[model samples]
Target: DPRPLNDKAFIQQCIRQLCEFLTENGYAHNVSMKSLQAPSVKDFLKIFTFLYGFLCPSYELPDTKFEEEVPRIFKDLGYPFALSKSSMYTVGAPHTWPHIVAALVWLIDCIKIH
Candidate 1:
């Protein structure tokens, strides 16, 4: 059911939100322009894969496992930046595209810094 677990609008929305979030949080001065544009799921996947390459540099990712873990791992890292759902508190569950961007972007920022 959650096989894709994402959509184009969500990808676009998240990229915009990530950009805005960086501005809102006072880091706009530091991020590259490429980081601000909303990407397709293909592009988003590529971006994260690129990030994962550097983050877990020497570690080769199994295709399925890579997809499975990225979102979950981002959830753990982004919980602080994640929005509060009506009942969901622990994991930052972004249902619509609006909800998808914030915390994941936070993870991006962290990666950028390190």
Candidate 2:
């Protein structure tokens, strides 16, 4: 009988492997235990590109933000402005793999709407 995968551990292992791969490939350096880290946006984009290239068939990642929609969302939420890079980074970085996966699903929905 097959058992379910320990997905949290699996994702953490993948992130570690990805960090090592980044260091080995010279995309990053000085990767000590403390320095070894999660993928940044550029690294995530690279991984996304590779995955899309092989698995996604015809689906393409969107690069352009929805210009009018973003501002309107901000306004509807009663925010003076939308989130900045720093704010987004702060929110995103603390999220676990499941959260990130859910966020990606939501992002796909947004892209579809736009």
Candidate 3:
């Protein structure tokens, strides 16, 4: 029988099925937002600001001389910097949770250096 899909219901059913599948595969664990809450909103804001700086490349200096040297400086310090595979060519693409944390650390380091 032909029937139009109920988009909202279908999405909800898909989500439920995926959650069940994850649980059955032993890949899903319940996380309490209450337990994972940031110690303070200030900490959350700091991380958010770091992430914003990374995405926007706000630390680039006015002089073109340091342009090529910036990435080299990061690498020489053993920092984790990644170039995007996309055409936009963004540096420090955070592909994992650890990468995101590392990127935030790098941003903080850059702030100190500046």
Candidate 4:
């Protein structure tokens, strides 16, 4: 059976196994509790950007604000802008697996759309 998501050890355990998974299919996956300890948006942007380039190789990255580009990504995928707008609040986004995994899930959904 799967572990409960909110169990405190879950994050620690997830990071260790996730490191192995990312290592296998690595894209500069450097997430760690150390990086997440930065008290700001951590190394997540690096992970997200790498995933974008990795998954959407045919697409050229636009030179624009990320917030702007995000809606463009959604629009290109036929998703409503509310899904875009509801997602952001902080500058670089939260540095947690829950948040990062959600972004990756969205990335996969967007990948399917294109």
Candidate 5:
């Protein structure tokens, strides 16, 4: 059974593990606790772009805005989470973090399976 990640310490631990996996697999972004806690739209874009390219070698990365490119990759991956483009602009809101970390976990699971 999965427990709700309401505890701050546990959530940070999960983020640390996710960041470690990403860093091991050539993730170029600086993933501090603050960054992971509240990643910018650009950070999420870079992460998804890297993962999309890594997983789908045949897919071409278009030179596009974060709003366009990131969602395109997520669509290709069949991502189930539906995040709003407007919601992504908030760079420092703690309320948005659970969704972000859950999305990261999903992406990491995709990588691990491949």
Candidate 6:
């Protein structure tokens, strides 16, 4: 399955990469796979906003519901996938979390080039 599970090496790698990013930004520390796999709402939003802030430093996030803002951020970033608010809320689902992980990785790559 392409979706991440607890034992999946791919997910572990993703988590490690994300933790590094989070730590560097002083946003989070010692983030574990389990927490990321089913993050609290605070964690979820923190990471998303961090990614957006890093990617679009000059742009202000529209004053709207975060779930609504999430896809808009991706759209502006030219991410091909259409990430819905439902997926953003349902982070525990296998389909959802991997996409989020991939989004984080993609954002990091975008940051590297700038």
Q: Which one wins on TM-score?
A: 6
CA lDDT, candidate 5, residue 61: 41
All candidates' TM-scores?
0.42, 0.33, 0.25, 0.47, 0.70, 0.76
* Prediction-by-prediction clash tally: 0, 0, 0, 0, 0, 0
Residue runs of model 1 more than 4 Å from their true location after superposition = 1-38, 59-62, 65-67, 76-95
Give candidate 4 misplaced runs (Cα > 4 Å): 1-21, 33-42, 58-63, 78-100, 108-114
TM-score of 5: 0.70
Superior candidate under TM-score, 2 versus 4 = 4
Best by lDDT: 6
Model 3: residues with Cα > 4 Å off, grouped in runs? 1-46, 50-80, 83-95
User: Which window of 10 residues has the lowest lDDT sum in candidate 5?
Assistant: 83-92
Clash list (residue pairs), candidate 1: none
Q: In candidate 1, how many Å is residue 66 off?
A: 5.0
Candidate 4 residues 1-114, lDDT tens each? 243546646555544544444455565645555554222323444554555765566655343465567556656755432434334334234433444343445565555465
Candidate 6, residues 1-114: lDDT per residue as tens digits? 344445467876887788778877677446665567667555677677777787566655344577787777778879887688888777657767766787777788888687
Cα RMSD, each candidate: 10.1, 11.0, 16.2, 5.9, 3.3, 3.3
Rank order (by TM-score, best first)? 6, 5, 4, 1, 2, 3
Of models 2 and 3, which has the larger lDDT? 2
Clashing pairs in 2: none
lDDT by residue (1-114, candidate 2, tens digit) is 131124556445544654454456454245432332344554444434433333345744433542333333435534443444443343226443333333333344343354
- Between candidates 4 and 6, name the one with more favorable lDDT: 6
Better of 2 and 5 by TM-score: 5
Question: Which residue ranges in model 2 land beyond 4 Å of their true spot?
Answer: 1-11, 17-36, 57-61, 66-92, 96-98, 101-114
lDDT of 1 by residue, 1-114 (tens): 322436656556556656655555554144444644433444444445555564577744344644456556566654444333431222222453334454455566676787
Q: How far is candidate 5 from the true structure (C-alpha RMSD, Å)?
A: 3.3
Model 5 Cα lDDT, one tens digit per residue, 1-114? 263657777777768877887778877766766567777666666665676666877755444555565655666779877655654555236766666676667788887898
Q: Give the TM-score of candidate 4.
A: 0.47
Ranking by lDDT: 6, 5, 1, 4, 2, 3
